[model samples]
Target chain A: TSQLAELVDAAAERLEVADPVAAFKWRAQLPIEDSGRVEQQLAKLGEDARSQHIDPDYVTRVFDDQIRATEAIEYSRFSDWKLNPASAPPEPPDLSASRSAIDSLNNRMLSQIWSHWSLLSAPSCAAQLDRAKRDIVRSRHLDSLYQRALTTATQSYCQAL
Target chain B: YLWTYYELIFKPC
Candidate 1:
């Protein structure tokens, strides 16, 4: 469970756009560069999960959420970047601060976690603790360093945890 | 894999 235990860093947006629509459209264009890479990685991950006797769907769910949360980071950064293009990318929102807006930017994970927690954790008796840990990481504590770590969480918190 | 969430946030994009 190292991979599961260790945090997964999300690829945040690094584009430099001057116009709003251009910035917005970069959303599609940006991930395009990464779409294939993301797909391949998830496939490999899925393959490995199945090899381990993990349900293929469950494996897909893991990496699927991995890919999902990763994109969640990207979209957040993109929106943050696009909305305040003139603001010089203003030192990535602290993970805690970012969490403050969690209901706003990352509601997707919020809603999905709430809705699919049961689905994601079916058949596992220990799922409650694991899901709670991950959820707390995502919803409660991880935001403090969300920017620095980008992929898994903020660097400091990720390491400290 | 990708379009599950942030995509919505970026919808504001």
Candidate 2:
């Protein structure tokens, strides 16, 4: 249960980095979609999932949601900034450093998910959902795009059980 | 089919 909470929290933490990345992209006028970088991450995730003996398809589904969530956040933030131009937008975070930080978090997240894979569909998971919400406060219904991905990424594992 | 099909087509799994 605690591990489940931690996993959801870790996803929110990954999301925290998206803000700075979004700002960076806004300042540089870079588009939200970056196929090359996404491909690199996707490939790495497949190898990692295989090594972990976890279903790559399941992991990839979670990952794609994470990507879409991050992109949604980034695109929305960038669009907001465009609506109200600032005198000078804040400096974007270093891309290499940000990617490294996100990747590190991703490793821990994947391992934790794998460790709990078998428990996903257990009754305790529904109970753990409460704990997860406490760790990362949010709504149940998909009222927001952010919550939508967060919910599915963490909860969809249950379908595997 | 978009989500599932996208994976079916693109992902080698």
Displacement of residue A51 (Cα, Å) in model 1 is: 3.1
CAPRI verdict (incorrect, acceptable, medium, high) for model 1: incorrect
> lDDT tens digits, residues A1-161, model 1?
32222222122221111122223345335442243234544565456545544444543443343444444555565676678766434233233333334334333333333333343344442444354445545543456434332433222111110
**Model 2 / residue B5 / CA error / Å:** 19
Model 2, docking class: incorrect
Off by over 4 Å in 1: A1-29, A32-34, A37-43, A86-127, A134-140, A144-161, B1-13
Weakest ten-residue segment in model 1 chain A by summed lDDT: A9-18
Name the top TM-score candidate. Answer: 2
DockQ of each: 0.09, 0.04
